[PDB]
Amino acid sequence: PLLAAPLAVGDTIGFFSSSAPATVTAKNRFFRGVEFLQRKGFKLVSGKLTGKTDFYRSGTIKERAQEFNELVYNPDITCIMSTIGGDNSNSLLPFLDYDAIIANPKIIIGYSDTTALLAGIYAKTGLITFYGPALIPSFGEHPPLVDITYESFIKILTRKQSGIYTYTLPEKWSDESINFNENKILRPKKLYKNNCAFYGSGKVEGRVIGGNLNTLTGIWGSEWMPEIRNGDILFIEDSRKSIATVERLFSMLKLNRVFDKVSAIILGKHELFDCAGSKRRPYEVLTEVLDGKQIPVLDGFDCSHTHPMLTLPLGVKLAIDFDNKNISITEQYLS
Amino acid sequence: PLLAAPLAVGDTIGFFSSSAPATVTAKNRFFRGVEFLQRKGFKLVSGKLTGKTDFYRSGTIKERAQEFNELVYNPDITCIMSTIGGDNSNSLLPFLDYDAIIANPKIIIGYSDTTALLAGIYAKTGLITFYGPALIPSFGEHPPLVDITYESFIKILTRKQSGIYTYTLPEKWSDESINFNENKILRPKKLYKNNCAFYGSGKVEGRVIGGNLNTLTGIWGSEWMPEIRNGDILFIEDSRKSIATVERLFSMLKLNRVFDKVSAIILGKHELFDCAGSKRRPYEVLTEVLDGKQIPVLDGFDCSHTHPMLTLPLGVKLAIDFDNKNISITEQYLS
Numbered sequence: 078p079l080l081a082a083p084l085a086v087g088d089t090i091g092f093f094s095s096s097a098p099a100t101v102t103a104k105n106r107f108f109r110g111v112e113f114l115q116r117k118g119f120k121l122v123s124g125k126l127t128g129k130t131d132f133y134r135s136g137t138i139k140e141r142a143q144e145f146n147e148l149v150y151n152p153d154i155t156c157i158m159s160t161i162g163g164d165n166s167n168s169l170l171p172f173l174d175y176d177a178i179i180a181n182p183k184i185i186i187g188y189s190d191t192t193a194l195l196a197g198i199y200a201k202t203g204l205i206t207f208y209g210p211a212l213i214p215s216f217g218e219h220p221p222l223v224d225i226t227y228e229s230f231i232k233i234l235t236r237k238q239s240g241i242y243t244y245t246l247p248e249k250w251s252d253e254s255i256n257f258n259e260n261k262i263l264r265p266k267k268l269y270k271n272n273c274a275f276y277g278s279g280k281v282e283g284r285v286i287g288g289n290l291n292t293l294t295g296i297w298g299s300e301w302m303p304e305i306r307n308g309d310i311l312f313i314e315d316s317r318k319s320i321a322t323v324e325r326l327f328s329m330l331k332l333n334r335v336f337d338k339v340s341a342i343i344l345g346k347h348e349l350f351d352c353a354g355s356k357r358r359p360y361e362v363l364t365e366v367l368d369g370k371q372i373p374v375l376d377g378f379d380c381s382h383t384h385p386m387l388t389l390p391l392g393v394k395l396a397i398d399f400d401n402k403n404i405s406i407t408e409q410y411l412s
Numbered sequence: 413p414l415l416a417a418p419l420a421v422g423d424t425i426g427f428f429s430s431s432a433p434a435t436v437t438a439k440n441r442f443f444r445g446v447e448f449l450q451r452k453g454f455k456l457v458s459g460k461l462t463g464k465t466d467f468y469r470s471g472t473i474k475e476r477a478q479e480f481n482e483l484v485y486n487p488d489i490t491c492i493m494s495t496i497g498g499d500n501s502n503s504l505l506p507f508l509d510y511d512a513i514i515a516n517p518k519i520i521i522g523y524s525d526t527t528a529l530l531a532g533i534y535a536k537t538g539l540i541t542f543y544g545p546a547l548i549p550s551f552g553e554h555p556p557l558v559d560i561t562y563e564s565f566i567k568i569l570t571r572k573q574s575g576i577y578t579y580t581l582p583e584k585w586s587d588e589s590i591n592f593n594e595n596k597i598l599r600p601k602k603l604y605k606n607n608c609a610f611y612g613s614g615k616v617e618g619r620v621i622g623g624n625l626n627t628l629t630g631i632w633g634s635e636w637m638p639e640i641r642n643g644d645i646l647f648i649e650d651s652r653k654s655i656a657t658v659e660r661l662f663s664m665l666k667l668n669r670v671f672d673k674v675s676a677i678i679l680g681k682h683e684l685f686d687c688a689g690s691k692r693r694p695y696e697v698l699t700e701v702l703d704g705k706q707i708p709v710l711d712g713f714d715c716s717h718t719h720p721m722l723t724l725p726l727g728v729k730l731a732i733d734f735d736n737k738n739i740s741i742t743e744q745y746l747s
């Protein structure tokens with residue numbers, strides 16, 4: 078695989094808005110995120126579409142591609158971070174400078190709609206990119222949850238590449254939709270005990286592939302969708318979806334023979350899942366779709382739209398130990 | 413192509429609910445549709461899931477496949493008609509009796525989510541299926557618009573298969589979200605002059621392929637997605653979507669090289685399109701995505717979620733005359 082250099086405290090992080098113009102619509106939270114990372118000692122470079130709006134997006138398809146490419150050209154930048162997702166990053170894919178990425182590999186990180194870029198870049202270049210924090214939703218989060226998000230971010234990206242890395246399990250989590258763009262909080266978010274479940278036995282090791290499943294539909298079938306292979310571990314998360322949408326997306330995977338290939342599935346915690354009164358969880362829907370076929374599932378991994386959020390390299394081997402109830406990175410993912 | 417027997421006055425129509433349980437949730441409109449077709453002289457066979465609910469759907473994946481298959485097995489049925497769409501018909505595809513569909517070809521008709529079945533059946537069998545009326549939303553519509561929908565339905569499906577068929581243009585249309593399941597109406601829908609536009613010159617003839625674009629994402633990449641070939645006319649429609657979603661879906665097509673293949677695009681009128689205050693129409697978004705690629709477009713064809721709705725065979729040749737501003741079926745589509 079193509080590997081970027083590790084992050085270090087004091088490095089320059091560049092940020093871009095490939096979809097929703099949240100540097101404007103969520104300016105307070107944006108500023109909180111900027112201040113948070115600056116206090117940690119990081120230098121921040123703002124992408125050229127910061128503070129701009131084109132209604133539902135930050136700018137034209139071509140301008141958004143340019144914003145990203147300009148960060149790739151900047152030799153001072155070690156990490157390229159999404160400000161926020163949205164719906165429209167897939168539009169950029171024909172216009173990204175993949176050859177420049179090959180020449181100057183960097184840490185590329187984000188989630189949700191940014192999946193189109195993470196997966197697309199991996200498909201074109203083999204660069205190991207990261208499912209992880211975006212500046213506004215992740216680092217604009219209030220304490221204490223933001224601290225746990227940062228702890229994972231810094232551990233994953235700065236640690237020495239020796240031996241396996243076994244993930245810590247967040248003690249508490251939340252998906253409550255309060256205190257987003259408000260400067261002062263009325264009360265802290267409702268905290269839930271971690272209900273992550275390991276369905277299966279033994280150990281499964283394989284290349285992790287995926288991201289935000291709804292977003293993957295925007296690149297599916299194209300040269301920008303990485304091929305899923307026999308033995309892969311499928312990582313998928315979604316946010317604020319109806320059970321109807323979740324069934325459709327799971328069946329899409331089934332039709333595409335994905336469940337014939339993968340040796341395990343990781344489901345990220347689904348933020349504010351709408352079960353339509355059925356009281357069914359996404360795992361139950363997956364079980365029906367699988368039609369009697371047994372695939373080991375890690376249900377409720379803290380790498381999604383819920384807080385706190387862990388950082389996960391995509392395109393490298395993970396080992397899920399279903400007996401010991403843990404998950405580890407087993408392949409080198411930074412140079 | 414595999415062709416079904418033509419419809420005739422007095423024939424038996426079977427209906428199925430492959431997704432949303434609207435025979436229950438829209439019972440008034442359902443009964444209106446039933447009574448409408450019965451007054452036209454049609455005999456109706458109720459699918460086994462009529463009157464049933466499983467929260468967001470009519471029944472389990474296998475129950476819904478069974479409901480559909482049972483209509484295929486019935487020798488008295490000439491037309492199999494969707495009650496309504498939803499989100500979940502793609503789930504049925506591994507379980508449909510394709511051999512029986514080939515042995516007993518019938519008119520299969522519906523729209524929206526039912527695209528998954530229409531396109532999937534075509535991919536597997538070569539049967540010419542129909543983008544057209546569903547029992548509840550289409551035939552439960554109040555006069556005057558339901559009569560125009562019916563006129564197209566009966567003309568397309570009963571006419572002699574000799575010479576080209578040139579579509580009529582509805583004088584008025586509506587997408588107003590009133591008078592759906594109410595038994596009594598306070599006033600009629602607002603009616604709009606037909607603003608259909610032909611962008612381009614000359615005449616384009618090619619096989620029509622597509623349906624509901626959002627729905628196609630659920631079968632994309634699989635053996636159930638019909639291959640789009642050089643020279644095809646792409647037919648796409650969506651309903652109640654944001655401009656953000658529309659950009660994502662158009663870019664999905666671009667990434668898949670669809671715009672390198674197709675000779676023309678038909679955009680169905682978009683029901684209650686949400687432009688996010690941009691005042692932009694879907695054609696403008698398509699124009700940006702096309703990035704200079706000159707493809708002639710019929711913008712606003714009345715085969716979508718708007719009323720009235722025309723009936724369109726999928727998988728046969730159409731001719732769009734951009735100079736004379738008309739559209740015709742040029743290939744035999746029923747036996």
Ligand SMILES: Nc1ncnc2c1ncn2[C@@H]1O[C@H](COP(=O)(O)O)[C@@H](O)[C@H]1O
Pocket residue numbers: 097161162163164188189190211214254255257258316348382
């Ligand atoms: N106005 C808002 N109020 C509460 N949460 C929001 C708001 N806007 C965005 N979010 C959260 O930010 C995430 C959306 O970011 P993305 O998935 O990148 O589009 C979701 O997890 C939402 O819960």
Ligand SMILES: Nc1ncnc2c1ncn2[C@@H]1O[C@H](COP(=O)(O)O)[C@@H](O)[C@H]1O
Pocket residue numbers: 432496497498523524525546549589590592593651683717718
């Ligand atoms: N409660 C409702 N009020 C108004 N229109 C509806 C309602 N439910 C469904 N529809 C319409 O029914 C049509 C068919 O739905 P679908 O088959 O899900 O695309 C769409 O054009 C919807 O706008």
